[PDB]
RNA sequence: GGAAGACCGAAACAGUUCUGACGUGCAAAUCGAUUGUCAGAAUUGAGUAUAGGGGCGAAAGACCAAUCGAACCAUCUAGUA
RNA sequence: AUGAGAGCCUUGGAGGACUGAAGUGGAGAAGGGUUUCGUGUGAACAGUGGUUGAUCACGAGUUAGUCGGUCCUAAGUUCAAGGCGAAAGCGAAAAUUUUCAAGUAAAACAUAAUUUUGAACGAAAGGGAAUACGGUUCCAAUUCCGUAACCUGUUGAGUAUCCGUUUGUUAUUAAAUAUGGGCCUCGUGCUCAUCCUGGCAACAGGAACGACCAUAAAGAAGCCGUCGAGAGAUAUCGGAAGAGUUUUCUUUUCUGUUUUAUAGCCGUACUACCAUGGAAGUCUUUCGCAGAGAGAUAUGGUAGAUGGGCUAGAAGAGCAUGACAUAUACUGUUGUGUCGAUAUUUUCUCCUCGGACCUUGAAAAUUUAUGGUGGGGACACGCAAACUUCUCAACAGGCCGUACCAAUAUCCGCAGCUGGUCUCCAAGGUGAAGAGUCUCUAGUCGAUAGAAUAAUGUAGGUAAGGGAAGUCGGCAAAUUAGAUCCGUAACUUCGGGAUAAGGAUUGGCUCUGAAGAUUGAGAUAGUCGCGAUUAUCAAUUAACAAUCAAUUCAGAACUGGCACGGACUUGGGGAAUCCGACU
RNA sequence: UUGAUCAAAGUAUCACGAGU
C-alpha cells in the first residue's frame, strides 16, 4: 500500500532544502530518506556547454577529492574546452606577428 | 487547408479586443519570433529573448537590433548614414 | 494477531479478462470520450515509431535502397500509411517498379 | 511548542513549579489564612502570555 | 564492510598492524566470509572451496581474537 | 502539432438566489441546497515597510484587531447644558 | 465482568455500519505549556450518569559532532557622528565624515598599486561540514545500546623521487621513477642533469610543487507541456510455505518472499566531443524542428551513468514465513528468501530538447581549477623529502531545542463551541479521473437516553387530468445531462454563435475483422556418429514460420422489466431590447 | 581580428664592496 511514510527531519512543506526519494530496509519498512541537492560540472566559459571530463559534484565536498578528479593535463583544464583553447591561442598568433611586421 | 481565413498568428486572441487592434498585432508578430538569416553565423536560427535583444542559437554571437523586425529600416539607414559620412572628417 | 479479512479480487480477474473477449465494452460502459480514452498523442506516437522500427532494419538489412527513405519519410511524416501492412506492398510494388526498370 | 529558546524553557519551569497547590502542612501556623491558592493555574481557564 | 581483497598475502599483511582487533568468520554452505573488524576500514577475503581455511586460517598473527561461529 | 488572461468541472478559494433551516443559534455571521472562476490581474505560510486628522484604498468614505465620515488607551476631565 | 450501584463512557468476547487514501488514519509546523505515562482515586469538573478521563491526588518522563538553531546574506530596520531640533529623538538611497582602509610574513625613506560608507542584526520555509540500519523502555531513538560509514581539525607513520654503471649480478640485469655524453687505458676519470609518466586527440592515472596576485565558472532557481531511463506503490502469471471456506462446486480468493548509507567492479539509456572521411539523385534524425563543406551519414574512440546489474556489507545478516522440541523463562534448533514478464503522473526522480514573455526568471558565506612575475625545492652512487589535493594510525567536536495534542476534546474563538488554521505522505474496484458511489489498510460509534405515530415546522419525495391560470416575477422545484454517428439557422471583427438547435443509436451473453514486439524463416553440399557438425540469401512477408504482448476499436448473429449512460458523475432551448465590452 | 599584459629590464655611474 504501504504503511505510510511521515517525514523525519524538522522540515515538512515541499521545498528545495529536500529533494527526497524511497529506498525500502531488511524490514519493509521504507523510512523516508532524502538525498543532497544534485551534483554537475564546471564549463568552458566561452563556449558555454557543459564541459567534458569532469566529475558531478558541488563546490561544498568538493575539496576532498584528488587532483585527477577536479581536472586535466592542460592550461585551463577545467576553466576551457578544447574547443575553447584552439580558437583562442592562435588568435592573437597571427596578430603578435602582425604585430612584427606592422612595427617595421 | 487553409486554416483560418485572414488573421493567421493572432488566432489565439480572437474575439477580443477589436478589429484593428486584432490586425495591428499581426502586422507586428509574423515578423517578431520567425527565422532570420544571420549576418554572421550564415544560417536561419533568430528568435528573440526580450524587446531588442536577439541571440542566434548556433555559434553564439548575440547582436542588439530592432525590436520587432531583426533590425529596422530605422537602422541601417543610420548605418548607411554613418558610413558615407565618415569618410568625410579625416578625409 | 487477529488474522485479517480477505480482500478478494476474484471478481476483477473476470473483467480484466472477459475484455479479452471484449463482453463489457461496447457503448453502454464508454463514459469518457474515446479521444482521451486512448490519445492521438500517444495512438500516433505508437503507429509512427513502430515504421521507423521497421524502418531501420530495412534501411540497413540491404533491402531498400538508401535514397528511398527521404521521399519516404516524408509519407511517414504525412499520413498515407494506416498499417505496417500497407507499407510493405508499397515497397512489394516500388521495389519491383525499380527492379525491372533497371 | 518544540522550538522554544533558553528563556521560555527557564520561564516555563516557573510557571511550572509554580502549580502546586498549598504546602500539605503550612495551614497550621498561626493565623492560618490560606485555604487554597491565588495563582492556582489550570491551562484552559488561565493564559500565560506575559 | 566497505572493502573486499581477493589477494592472500595482503590479506595476511594487512593483518598486522595497530588495528585488525578481531576476525569474524562464518561457515556458509556457499563460501566462507572473512571479516576482521580494522579502525577505519574493514577487509574481507571471500573463500569458497572448503579447504583453504586451514591453511590460511593459522597463517595468523598469534594475539588475534577468533570470533568463531559456525 | 498544444499555444491563448479560451471552456464544463475537484480539494483552493470565494459568497449569488432561495429573501428556505436556527435568528435567548452552531455562531457578536454559521450550517444545508444551490451558482462563478480554476493554469494567472490567479491562490498563499513566514520575513519587512507604511501611523491617528494619518496609513492605505483595480475607489465603497471600504479597511486599520468584534470599533472607521476618524479610531484605540490615561489626562487638562466631577469639562458645558 | 468488575462495580455499593452501568444504555454509555470503563473495559476486554462477538460482530453489524460508518471515516473512504484531496479520511473521523500515521507523523511535521505556528500557537499551546506538563496535557504525553504509570499508579491511586471523594466532592465540584466531563451543559445525563461515571468504576476511565485533556480535573485533581501522587509519581516518573524529553539524551546527539551527522536532525537543527548556530555561520552567509535577502527586502529593511537607519543602529558611526558630517548634520539640523528647545531637548526626546529624526513617518530619512545618512554615499561629505584626519588615517574615517580589512590590511598584507612587511622594504628603506607616510610596506606596494590596491579598500569607501565604516558595524551589526535579520530564513529551526531560502542559502548549508558530513549517516544511517536493525532491535530496545512504564512514555523516549537518524540521540540509548548492538553494529556499520563519514566530515572537520590536529598529530604521527609509510609514500615518484638511489643514475651511465656496476655494489646484487659474468654480461644480458637489477636497487635504481628513464642516464647519457665526449674523453679515456676501459673508464675507475671527466661531464651532464631529474620539481611524474600515458595517448594523433577528447582526456587518462594512486599520489608529484599556490605563499600572494589574477580571470573563469560553480555556489545560483523562476514557471509552464515534454520522449528516454530508474526508483518505489500496485497489478496479473508460476514455483514455493502455511492459512480461507465446503450442502453442493471450485488444480481456488490470503499473508509472504525483502537487503539501507558508504564502497569496488562490470558499467547502456543518452546528448555533446575526437580521429578519419568528403555527402545533390541531398542526406540524417525525432512526439515536434533540429541538424549539416563553420564537416552531415558513416568507422572506431573520448568523457558525464546520474541509472542499473553481481560482489563486498549478509552470523541460514538481521528480518520474516512457518516448522519441531523445551513447566517454560534473558531458550533451543529445522527450513525458506525462486523466477519471468505486463503499466502508470490514482507520485517523486537524473536526462533530453522546444514553449509563452514591453512577464527574462535573487543575492552573498564557503570552493575549485587555471593564469602569473618572483621565490622556494632541487646533488645522482643518493640519506631523501614532500601545508604531501596519496595510503594510513591515534586524537577531541562545545552550546541548547527534543515527551504530546498538532484540532467535531490540548489553538484563537469568554467555553472540550458544525465556525477561520501552514503543509506532508495517499490504496481495491467502476471510471475520463485525485469525480461520485462502495471495501481492504489504519480508526472511530463521539454528538442525552429507553420509548411514541398529534398538529405545524424541519429536510428527501411521488400524485390521475390540464399544464403559469398561479404570484411582484417562471422563484423553490421538473425535464435535459455521459460517449459515439450525423445533422447545424440568422449575425459575425470571419478566431465564432457551436454542446446550437433538430435526431437516431447505447444491456447481458456468444463471436469473427483489425492496431505490435522478439527470434526472421534460412536453401545448398558433406562430415562424424537419425545424433553431432558445417553455410549463401532472392522470394519471403503481411498481423510469414516459432514465440510473447498491451488494450482500445470495427462490425455481426441470438436473447431480456421491453428497462437500458439502468443509481452516481451531469446542459433546458429559442427571436428580440437596454446595459456594460470582455476574463 | 571575444588572447593577453601588474610585480623592471635595459642603461649609467657609484655600492664600486663584503666574503675572498
Redesign the pocket.
Known amino acids: ?17 529536500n ?13 523516508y ?2 538525498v543532497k ?2 551534483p ?1 560540472v ?2 568552458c ?2 563556449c558555454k ?1 557543459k564541459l ?2 569532469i ?2 559534484s ?7 577529492m ?3 578528479l ?10 576551457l ?3 575553447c583553447l584552439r580558437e ?1 591561442i592562435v ?2 598568433f ?3 606577428e ?1 604585430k612584427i611586421v606592422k612595427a617595421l | 487547408a487553409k486554416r ?4 493567421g498568428i493572432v ?9 484593428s487592434l ?1 490586425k495591428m498585432v499581426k502586422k507586428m508578430e509574423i515578423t517578431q ?1 520567425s527565422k532570420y538569416t544571420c549576418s ?4 536561419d ?1 533568430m ?1 528573440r ?3 531588442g535583444i536577439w541571440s542566434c ?4 554571437r548575440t547582436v542588439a537590433g530592432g525590436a520587432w523586425v531583426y533590425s529596422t529600416t530605422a537602422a541601417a539607414s543610420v548605418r548607411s548614414a554613418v558610413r558615407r559620412l565618415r569618410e568625410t572628417k579625416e578625409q | 494477531k487477529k ?8 471478481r ?2 473476470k ?2 479478462e ?21 490519445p ?2 500517444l495512438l ?7 515504421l ?3 524502418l ?1 532494419k530495412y ?1 540497413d538489412s ?2 531498400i ?7 519516404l ?1 516524408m509519407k511517414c ?1 504525412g499520413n498515407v500509411f494506416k ?3 500497407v ?3 508499397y515497397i ?1 510494388k516500388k ?1 519491383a517498379e525499380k527492379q525491372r526498370s533497371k | ?6 528563556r ?2 527557564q520561564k ?1 519551569a516557573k ?2 513549579k509554580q ?3 498549598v504546602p ?1 502542612w503550612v495551614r497550621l501556623r498561626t493565623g492560618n489564612t490560606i485555604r487554597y491558592n491565588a495563582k492556582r ?5 488561565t ?3 506575559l | ?4 581483497i581477493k589477494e592472500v598475502k595482503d590479506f595476511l599483511n594487512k593483518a598486522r ?3 585488525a582487533r578481531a576476525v ?1 568468520i ?1 561457515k ?1 554452505p556457499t ?1 566462507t ?1 572473512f ?1 576482521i ?6 577487509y ?1 577475503l ?1 573463500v569458497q572451496d572448503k579447504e583453504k581455511a586451514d591453511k590460511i586460517k593459522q597463517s595468523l598473527p598469534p594475539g588475534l581474537q577468533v570470533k568463531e ?1 559456525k
Open positions: 500500500m504501504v504503511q505510510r511514510l511521515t517525514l523525519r527531519r524538522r522540515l515538512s512543506y515541499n521545498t528545495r532544502s529533494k527526497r526519494r524511497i529506498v525500502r530496509t531488511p524490514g519493509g519498512r521504507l523510512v530518506q532524502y541537492k544534485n554537475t564546471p564549463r566559459g566561452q556547454e567534458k571530463g566529475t558531478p558541488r563546490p561544498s565536498e568538493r575539496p576532498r584528488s587532483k585527477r577536479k581536472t586535466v593535463s592542460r592550461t585551463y583544464g577545467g576553466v574546452c578544447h574547443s583562442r588568435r592573437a597571427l596578430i603578435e602582425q | 483560418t481565413k485572414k488573421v488566432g489565439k486572441y480572437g474575439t477580443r479586443y477589436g478589429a486584432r519570433h554572421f553565423c550564415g544560417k536560427s528568435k529573448a526580450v524587446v542559437k548556433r555559434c553564439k | 488474522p485479517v479479512v480477505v480482500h478478494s479480487r476474484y476483477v480477474r473483467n480484466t472477459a475484455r479479452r473477449k471484449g463482453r463489457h465494452c461496447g457503448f453502454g460502459k464508454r463514459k469518457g470520450t474515446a479521444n482521451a480514452r486512448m492521438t498523442k500516433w506516437m505508437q503507429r509512427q515509431r513502430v521507423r522500427r521497421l531501420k534501411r540491404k533491402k535502397d538508401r535514397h528511398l527513405y527521404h521521399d519519410y511524416k498499417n505496417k501492412r507499407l510493405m506492398e512489394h521495389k | 511548542a518544540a522550538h522554544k529558546s533558553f521560555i524553557k516555563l510557571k511550572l502549580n502546586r497547590s500539605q493555574r489550570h491551562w484552559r481557564r493564559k500565560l502570555k | 564492510m566497505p572493502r573486499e598492524r595497530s588495528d569474524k562464518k556458509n563460501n566470509k571479516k573488524r580494522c579502525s577505519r576500514f574493514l574481507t571471500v561461529v
